[PDB]
Amino acid sequence: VMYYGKGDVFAYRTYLKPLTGVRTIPESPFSGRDHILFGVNVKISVGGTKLLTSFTKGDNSLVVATDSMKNFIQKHLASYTGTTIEGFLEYVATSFLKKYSHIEKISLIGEEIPFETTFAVKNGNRAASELVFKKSRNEYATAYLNMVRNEDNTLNITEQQSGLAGLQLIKVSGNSFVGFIRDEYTTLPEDSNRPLFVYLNIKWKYKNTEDSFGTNPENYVAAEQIRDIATSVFHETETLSIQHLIYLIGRRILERFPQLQEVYFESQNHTWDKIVEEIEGKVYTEPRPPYGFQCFTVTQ
Amino acid sequence: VMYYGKGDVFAYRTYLKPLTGVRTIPESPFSGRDHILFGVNVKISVGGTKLLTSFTKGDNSLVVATDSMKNFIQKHLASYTGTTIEGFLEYVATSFLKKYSHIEKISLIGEEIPFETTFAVKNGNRAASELVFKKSRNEYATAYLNMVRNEDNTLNITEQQSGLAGLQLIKVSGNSFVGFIRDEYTTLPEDSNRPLFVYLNIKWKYKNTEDSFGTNPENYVAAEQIRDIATSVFHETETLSIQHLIYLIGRRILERFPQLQEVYFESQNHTWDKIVEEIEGKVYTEPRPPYGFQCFTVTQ
Amino acid sequence: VMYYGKGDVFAYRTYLKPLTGVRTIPESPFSGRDHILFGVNVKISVGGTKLLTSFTKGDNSLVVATDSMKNFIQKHLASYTGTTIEGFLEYVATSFLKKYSHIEKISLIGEEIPFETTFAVKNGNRAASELVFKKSRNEYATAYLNMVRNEDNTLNITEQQSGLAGLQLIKVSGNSFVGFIRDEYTTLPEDSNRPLFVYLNIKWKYKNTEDSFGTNPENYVAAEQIRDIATSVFHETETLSIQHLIYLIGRRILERFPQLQEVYFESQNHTWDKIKVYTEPRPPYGFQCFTVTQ
Amino acid sequence: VMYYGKGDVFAYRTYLKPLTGVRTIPESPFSGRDHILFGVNVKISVGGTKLLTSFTKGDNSLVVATDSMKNFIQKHLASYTGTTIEGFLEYVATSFLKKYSHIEKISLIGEEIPFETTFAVKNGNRAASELVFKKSRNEYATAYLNMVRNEDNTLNITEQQSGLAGLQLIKVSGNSFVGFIRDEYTTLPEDSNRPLFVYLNIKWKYKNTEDSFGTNPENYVAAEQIRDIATSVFHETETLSIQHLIYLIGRRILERFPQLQEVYFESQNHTWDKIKVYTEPRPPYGFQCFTVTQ
């Protein structure tokens, strides 16, 4: 392996081109993004056989400084005319490989920095502010893009993924976990009504990469819509495990978005413990640190 | 000094008594709390001259185990019949001092664990879920209560404060910081239009402690309403500094809530830097770690 | 209340004047600091009645920008000729009030950024490097200073404290917690041999503020020495509670350092649960606050 | 993909069998581990075709609860008779696949929880305590193991790696970064003497998996020794980049440990900005990934 790059390249700008013309689904009122305030955190990693002597000899002749990669990313947000985080990564990647022809591969991760609308009273009228936004530390959209320059000097995307990260959902009732193996290592009691608390990271892969860029926005799959499917499916279903929940969420995603090839889940179990004192309302509290987790792919 | 206690006592319960009958203000649509899902993180600290030998001699005869304080808090959330985090602390404090008459002082901090409504589709109807909630890592309500047992064995509250913590607001334009001292230590340029990013922690003190408990809920001041004043005032005003912004927020709070005696601000400045590369849309990025801060009290 | 300032002002300096000639105590090998690499994280807060209109009117005419406070701190680490973090805060505070006559009060917190030595081979000899250091995220020295300008324009120290923060100590045996109140709320079993795991913040106040500056280094009390007293006392004693442990640590500190007026403790209990094998507990943690005076 | 498991399974054990008889190298004093106190944080992941219906139908009949995996790990630390974190993972993996025939693959990550010795006075003599240890939040040993059940029911190790994580090293001088591309996007000045601050994660693979278990301790490679090689090489060399530094560290590791097949580096650049006085940079950090093979 031989890669180098820059992480935590934050970039914020106002008045990105709005995302509109999206295709709606029953589970979500999402209708687009006004993009008055946009933020992204980018990680860039590059490689190429011509970088060998920067490691073996200390020869920096062909090294793009990682500080310069930071400048490159931030400058390209200023000139980006598109509407999605996926399209921004494609713009950066194509531009970078065209600039530096000795680079054979670039990998980009983009994580949206989400902001929420606030309201203000102007002359007796309370209405959405175009100026003041709340920074959110909750869920956010993500994107991943890898691109190569082939031996014949043509350029190709080699992996593209979109995602939703940081979603934390608790369902207070309507969840069971029963019927699991009870042997000499089992101290977990059967529970026909637990308050299941799941962390969800969800990623999806398009059949056609062009659909990820917003160029024809009716074919875009928004992380907001995926989020809203997840919350609806969790509500609708008596869950039998996190495994079965994420299967059902994935099936619903692929049914709603036939342009997707597959969907990938990383879930964690953070369910609260019943308190020690006997019960009045039932009371729960934080568990010990060990957390369950699941990784699962659903394909068309 | 001589105190001991328990921190990070989390307690979650469903169907706390709803908060309704609140008094509205122009800046906020807040109309109450449904309390289907309630969470709080409590810190308890106690003291008393009779605890001396637990330090000086290792005699635990009069020590309430901190684990037992945790049990006490969690059990009392199960039996609490009120509607506010302030009233919950009062219930815990009065009950604890009545149980343990050798304790002379108790200090409680409560931090709400906020949850946000989600939506689900049931038989074609998309509507607020009573089951699935999103855990929020954004702003949250707080409460502080100190109570003593006097030498004559009567009980009194000795300090009570309510608050809002973790509010992060960015205003993209309509902020200036000019006219400050320019001397041999000054490298900051004058800026007539900066994207001011402030962290706000806001605390308030009632004239009459009973108004904090929800018993007559029209006299309650909700952290939600304080939040909404802060966002409105930030929008309405060309800011001249964070100092002047928090003064104006405080004045508006005290005007809207004449039952409050004073309001206290802890603010931090986290404003982004303009990027190094020249500009296309202007682009900003994260600053170096040093952050400005302000502490300020406004009184009636 | 009316204060403003800057937090997280980091400053890293090479070749500060070495701290030497400190009095060594039996609990600790500490005998000074080479100061090849010295880092500090400073928080500055200032106030004064003449700042009122910066809040009430948006008038910045008397505002020292917090960014300029950051520059002031960093520049003064470059010019500081002393040997201790306490002396550095004194230098910053005096310098700042002398520079800005409208400031009536300044409060400073300094946290040392600790570095540890590393091994290098030089001509076959393994020894501590003079060039390569390891950044530590464990315990660290602290200092606190509040200074005011009086109406007669004299400057006065109103608060001064030194400290050790972030010390995490576990003793595998020789600890009990028994005899506490058992009632309707008690589920904790009595335990005659627990692996007590304590977090310790320890603060001390000098009888004579001059002793904190290193001017006469025989009178300086190093956070390293306080750490080593804490571990020695923890080892020596069959503990009966965290309360009684911190009492005994504090008594030893005051006995070893008669120039100290008081010691202050903030402890937390992070003892593992028994499943011998132990594991991490649930989040609630016990804590204690306690002062011993000379 | 179809896996599930448990993360953050902490387990703390006293008096593990000591690691002794290790081969010492010139860069490091390391000569074993007393193992009075031993902590590990384990992540377990398992899979198998027979788990399909636990996802597709909600049938838990073949689900080992992740809580039970936690119990399994913790109990096996109590019964483990070996001397290394790599050997502990092997014991857990073999034991788990032998217990649960429907599991076809298991992946384990183990992170050592590092403790440091402390000073105590015993009858006037200051010495390392056998009872009181300091919890360290600095660098730590790691191990990784993947094991599968074949169709003929043999068990096979498919991946195995050891590591050192969280090493943070700053070298005050003797580092350059010059000669890189300067174009429209370059604002970074050339620097002939920077205080290079690197974070290092270092991983290695043995030629013979048996060497990782400590069974023959002369062949074990301790994370402590890798750390000390890293600091020695950093010291010895006028660095020309992080890229070239990690190349030289890796070459020295493979020379000192011919039983190793490869070394892998994940480095990050956290060098301070110059305001001599330096300060913390803005958040963006450089990083490098690089493998050296024997």
Ligand SMILES: O=c1[nH]c(=O)c2nn[nH]c2[nH]1
């Ligand atoms: O949903 C769950 N899946 C699991 O595998 C599991 N194991 N313990 N609890 C659990 N809950």
Ligand SMILES: O=c1[nH]c(=O)c2nn[nH]c2[nH]1
């Ligand atoms: O609003 C501000 N107040 C201040 O005191 C300050 N100092 N630098 N920038 C600043 N901005």
Ligand SMILES: O=c1[nH]c(=O)c2nn[nH]c2[nH]1
């Ligand atoms: O040392 C202790 N002090 C306490 O107050 C306490 N309470 N529970 N466990 C405890 N341990």
Ligand SMILES: O=c1[nH]c(=O)c2nn[nH]c2[nH]1
């Ligand atoms: O060691 C370095 N390698 C790099 O690639 C680099 N880029 N900017 N600074 C750097 N330093």
Ligand SMILES: [K+]
């Ligand atoms: K719309």
Ligand SMILES: [K+]
């Ligand atoms: K209502």
